[PDB]
Design a protein around this ligand. Sequence first.
Ligand SMILES: [Zn+2]
Ligand SMILES: [Zn+2]
Lengths: 150, 158
Amino acid sequence: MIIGNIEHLEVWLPTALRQAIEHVNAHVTTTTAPGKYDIDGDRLFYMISENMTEPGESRSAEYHARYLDIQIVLQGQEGMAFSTRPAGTPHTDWLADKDIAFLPTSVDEKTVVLNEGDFVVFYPGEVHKPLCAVGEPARVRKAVVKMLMA
Amino acid sequence: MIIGNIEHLEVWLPTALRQAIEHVNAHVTTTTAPGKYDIDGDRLFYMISENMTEPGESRSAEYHARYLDIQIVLQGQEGMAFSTRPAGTPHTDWLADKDIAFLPTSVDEKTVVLNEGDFVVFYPGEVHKPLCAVGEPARVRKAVVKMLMALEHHHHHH
Ligand SMILES: [Zn+2]
Ligand SMILES: [Zn+2]
């Protein structure tokens, strides 16, 4: 996984990901409604969302098979949980239809706290659990970039 | 910065990083003594160390201008502190001669807990503070790979 901040994109970020984040930076405002927004067909697009965080123990983790995720905090504070090891057995496998599988929290799960402008990149297979509460549940507004891997 | 685990080197990890970790995996035992071990002279080498963790507060972060770091936990549990933002003002700038600048903790400092086999990658300019205590101070055995980067990846002041 990769961690960075959207106001400070460096050459070490793969160029296609840098360009996607710059697209989000150039087009998203605080008034952009929740929904799906275009960049490059099914190869690159992004979703705006706003949700309450919740205790990490109350959500399943997820992974994808075809799409990379860029998770960008626009407003708020988000606990991002993840594993550095391959996914365990999912309780839900919708990879063919929806490119997502859900599975229970791993023994090795880590958490990083993300503030405004921070982003994380998860490549296919990387287990992640967004929107974990940091203290009391609270609203987080985010962009999630999806990029189709070759 | 990149986070992964040395037992699961995936297609998304840059090839040169994968090959360096593969070398560490094939040449470091649990007995390998602390010291400096060259893979390709000063273009690519690693340090084996056994240090005690310390609380991160009031200790200095650092960054480099030319070397990328791969920090690998071989044994133990390490708090890895870091910043997602460019470096602020250092108290000491030894970048040109020693490839390191030291600076006080940033307001935005984050920490991730690393266990056996976990690794993090810091490109030049990425601010980091290794060896932070997780609970009580404890010993951590590590490999730190130093890899000379091409011009495009060098640190920039602005
Ligand atoms: Zn996802
Ligand atoms: Zn370093």
